[PDB]
Amino acid sequence: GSHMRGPNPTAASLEASAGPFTVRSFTVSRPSGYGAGTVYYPTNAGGTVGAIAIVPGYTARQSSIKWWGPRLASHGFVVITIDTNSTLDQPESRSSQQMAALRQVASLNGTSSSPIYGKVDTARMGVMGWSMGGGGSLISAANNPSLKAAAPQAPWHSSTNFSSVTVPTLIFACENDSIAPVNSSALPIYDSMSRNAKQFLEINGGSHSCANSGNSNQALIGKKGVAWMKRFMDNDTRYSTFACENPNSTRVSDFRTANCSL
């Protein structure tokens, strides 16, 4: 049950702004259980690809997280980026809306008129998001253990105990985060998970927006995000090296992993 699409990656090629596959996008016409959606898909991937739903933080919109659209989609995924019903939605609401976006992607996969008909393996899904949307991503993983992977960024939740989570979980953390401090949010969430493949990448002198569109580490962050999603959503062991690697870089202030078999 492996699903290998594309060429054998290299560090240099995963650090590039774009993967091998051409990306098109469209706006969701009638959003079902969320505010608005942009869908990114690869035009000719060679086989069905998994879907990733990405949710912003409090007051934020699609622009905060938009870069992940092409970065992942060009490596063979369907990515939906959402605006929430209200810019002031809390983490549990952000999780329900994340799962509704995945449901409507499974829907547009069965929709002869949609540009993604037949394009999706609906049994291969992942979740990502920023701050309260990263908290929602961890709530989606805890409630839906069939999800293949989770890669939240600068995660925010009112509770740090995610000990139930069995989904392979990569947490991007920002060293200088004053909004969701690492010592009280990202690290405690990471320390709670003992039943899963997990990783903690912390960006040297990073602010709260250190993994957002236009950050100064899209090379490293993008490489790690694609690696983690290819390893765990496709069971593609070509990406085991990149997924589990402790990057030798000054751009990283901390790195931890567990159950990440090479």
UniProtKB/Swiss-Prot annotation:
Transmembrane segments: none
Residues at the catalytic site: S131 (nucleophile), D177 (charge relay system), H208 (charge relay system)
GO biological-process terms attached to the record: xenobiotic catabolic process
Induction info: Highly up-regulated during growth on PET film.
Result when mutating S64M: Increases activity towards 1-naphthyl butyrate
Uses described in the biotechnology field: Has potential for application in environmental remediation and biological recycling of PET and PEF waste products.
Protein's name according to its UniProt entry: Poly(ethylene terephthalate) hydrolase
Highest classification ranks of the organism: Bacteria, Pseudomonadati, Pseudomonadota, Betaproteobacteria, Burkholderiales
